Design an enzyme around this catalytic site. Structure first.
Site, PDB file in Angstrom:
ATOM      1  N   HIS A   8       0.829  -1.199   0.000  1.00 32.10           N
ATOM      2  CA  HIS A   8       0.000   0.000   0.000  1.00 32.10           C
ATOM      3  C   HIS A   8       0.866   1.252   0.000  1.00 32.10           C
ATOM      4  O   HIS A   8       0.890   1.997   0.986  1.00 32.10           O
ATOM      5  CB  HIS A   8      -0.932   0.001   1.214  1.00 32.10           C
ATOM      6  CG  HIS A   8      -1.954  -1.091   1.192  1.00 32.10           C
ATOM      7  ND1 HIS A   8      -1.631  -2.417   1.383  1.00 32.10           N
ATOM      8  CD2 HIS A   8      -3.297  -1.055   1.017  1.00 32.10           C
ATOM      9  CE1 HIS A   8      -2.727  -3.152   1.316  1.00 32.10           C
ATOM     10  NE2 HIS A   8      -3.752  -2.350   1.095  1.00 32.10           N
ATOM     11  N   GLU A  54       0.679 -22.508  -8.674  1.00 34.17           N
ATOM     12  CA  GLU A  54      -0.320 -23.369  -9.298  1.00 34.17           C
ATOM     13  C   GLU A  54      -0.431 -23.129 -10.799  1.00 34.17           C
ATOM     14  O   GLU A  54      -0.757 -24.055 -11.550  1.00 34.17           O
ATOM     15  CB  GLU A  54      -1.670 -23.167  -8.609  1.00 34.17           C
ATOM     16  CG  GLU A  54      -2.871 -23.656  -9.399  1.00 34.17           C
ATOM     17  CD  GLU A  54      -4.105 -23.819  -8.532  1.00 34.17           C
ATOM     18  OE1 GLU A  54      -3.966 -24.252  -7.368  1.00 34.17           O
ATOM     19  OE2 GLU A  54      -5.216 -23.518  -9.014  1.00 34.17           O
ATOM     20  N   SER A  96      -5.557 -17.106   7.948  1.00 36.99           N
ATOM     21  CA  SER A  96      -5.034 -17.642   6.700  1.00 36.99           C
ATOM     22  C   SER A  96      -3.872 -16.828   6.138  1.00 36.99           C
ATOM     23  O   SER A  96      -3.487 -17.040   4.983  1.00 36.99           O
ATOM     24  CB  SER A  96      -6.156 -17.724   5.663  1.00 36.99           C
ATOM     25  OG  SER A  96      -5.798 -18.574   4.589  1.00 36.99           O
ATOM     26  N   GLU A 136       0.919  -7.134   0.996  1.00 40.63           N
ATOM     27  CA  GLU A 136       1.822  -7.031   2.140  1.00 40.63           C
ATOM     28  C   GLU A 136       1.103  -7.117   3.481  1.00 40.63           C
ATOM     29  O   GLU A 136       1.749  -6.970   4.525  1.00 40.63           O
ATOM     30  CB  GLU A 136       2.666  -5.747   2.050  1.00 40.63           C
ATOM     31  CG  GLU A 136       2.261  -4.550   2.916  1.00 40.63           C
ATOM     32  CD  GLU A 136       1.189  -3.705   2.276  1.00 40.63           C
ATOM     33  OE1 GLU A 136       1.163  -2.484   2.537  1.00 40.63           O
ATOM     34  OE2 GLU A 136       0.379  -4.257   1.509  1.00 40.63           O
TER      35      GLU A 136
HETATM   36  O1  LIG Z   1      -6.185  -2.588   0.402  1.00 42.64           O
HETATM   37  C1  LIG Z   1      -7.510  -2.249   0.790  1.00 42.64           C
HETATM   38  C2  LIG Z   1      -7.626  -0.779   1.115  1.00 42.64           C
HETATM   39  O2  LIG Z   1      -7.358  -0.062  -0.099  1.00 42.64           O
HETATM   40  C3  LIG Z   1      -7.307   1.353   0.082  1.00 42.64           C
HETATM   41  O3  LIG Z   1      -7.038   1.971  -1.128  1.00 42.64           O
HETATM   42  C4  LIG Z   1      -8.646   1.864   0.604  1.00 42.64           C
HETATM   43  O4  LIG Z   1      -9.637   1.712  -0.406  1.00 42.64           O
HETATM   44  C5  LIG Z   1      -9.061   1.117   1.864  1.00 42.64           C
HETATM   45  O5  LIG Z   1     -10.374   1.506   2.247  1.00 42.64           O
HETATM   46  C6  LIG Z   1      -9.005  -0.388   1.639  1.00 42.64           C
HETATM   47  O6  LIG Z   1      -9.253  -1.076   2.860  1.00 42.64           O
END
Ligand SMILES: OC[C@H]1O[C@@H](O)[C@@H](O)[C@@H](O)[C@@H]1O
Ligand SMILES: CCCCCCCCCCCCCCCC(=O)O
Length: 255
Positions: A87, A190, A167, A161
């Site tokens: 992210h 797979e 899980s 990440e």
């Molecule tokens: O990776 C998931 C996340 O992605 C981000 O861009 C947002 O949209 C968050 O609200 C979401 O939980």
């Protein structure tokens, strides 16, 4: 308890995560980095608002991706490709770049509550050209629709990440235990698809994007593959630490 806290955050939890990135106690995390991290966090949302309305034809021609040929040659080889990124930066802008320079790709979406909120996220990303598969409650099993795209020599994109459920795959991340999704490693095994680590960041008023050499999935060991995935993400996050919008609890110990 932990499932609820794991989906909260704010500047206090951000300091605890950046503490691992820089290797210092929470109080010693530079105040300038926290401000840069919040400022980066605000920018993604400011862009996510107007991104569906911008000139995507301009964006595709003027934005660049480091080592993009890594992905092309793997699609020229008929293998498919798994793009796993953290992210960081603006990944919806990176998807826009891929939609214009290649075409629609597939991804998964957590089924948020209320449903209307979930519906908005689908519309948003579909209005960018992405295919959104519901992680739960959908018509088909997500893992198996994605596997069809990979054997069909198509790219899928997964935010890969963080996954603090039963899980998730435990791995080392800046010297401490976290959990990451098994999806990326299991799909490259797979199906034989190429597993490319990907990173997005903010390069001034622009967007920086990069494809890294594909990981070795020969071992078939999800931990060994995901650990190399963690090592690459940590190496990239450490270079652009302010552009990593992890305000949620990341490491197991913080739960
Ligand atoms: O990776 C998931 C996340 O992605 C981000 O861009 C947002 O949209 C968050 O609200 C979401 O939980
Ligand atoms: C060559 C680099 C291209 C990178 C393309 C990145 C596009 C990723 C878009 C992801 C959208 C979905 C985000 C949340 C999904 C989830 O909850 O797992």
């Amino acid at each position: 308890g932990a499932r609820y806290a794991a989906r909260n955050g704010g500047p206090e939890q951000l300091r605890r995560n950046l503490a691992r990135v820089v290797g210092k106690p929470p109080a010693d995390v530079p105040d300038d980095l926290i401000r840069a991290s919040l400022a980066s966090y605000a920018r993604y949302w400011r862009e996510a608002f107007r991104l569906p309305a911008m000139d995507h034809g301009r964006l595709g021609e003027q934005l660049d991706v480091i080592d993009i040929d890594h992905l092309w040659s793997a699609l020229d080889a008929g293998r498919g490709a798994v793009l796993a990124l953290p992210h960081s930066g603006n990944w919806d802008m990176a998807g826009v770049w891929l939609v214009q320079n290649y075409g629609p790709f597939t991804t998964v979406a957590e089924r948020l509550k209320p449903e209307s909120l979930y519906r908005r996220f689908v519309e948003y990303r579909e209005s960018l050209g992405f295919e959104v598969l519901p992680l739960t409650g959908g018509e088909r099993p997500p893992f198996e629709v994605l596997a069809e795209r990979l054997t069909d020599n198509r790219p899928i994109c997964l935010m890969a990440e963080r996954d603090l459920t039963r899980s998730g795959v435990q791995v080392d991340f800046f010297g401490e235990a976290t959990r990451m999704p098994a999806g990326p490693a299991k799909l490259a095994i797979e199906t034989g698809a190429a597993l490319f680590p990907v990173h997005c960041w903010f390069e001034g008023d622009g967007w920086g994007m990069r494809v890294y050499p594909e990981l070795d999935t020969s071992s078939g060991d999800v931990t060994a593959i995901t650990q190399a995935l963690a090592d690459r993400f940590a190496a990239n996050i450490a270079t652009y630490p302010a552009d990593w919008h992890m305000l949620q609890p990341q490491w197991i110990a913080d739960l």
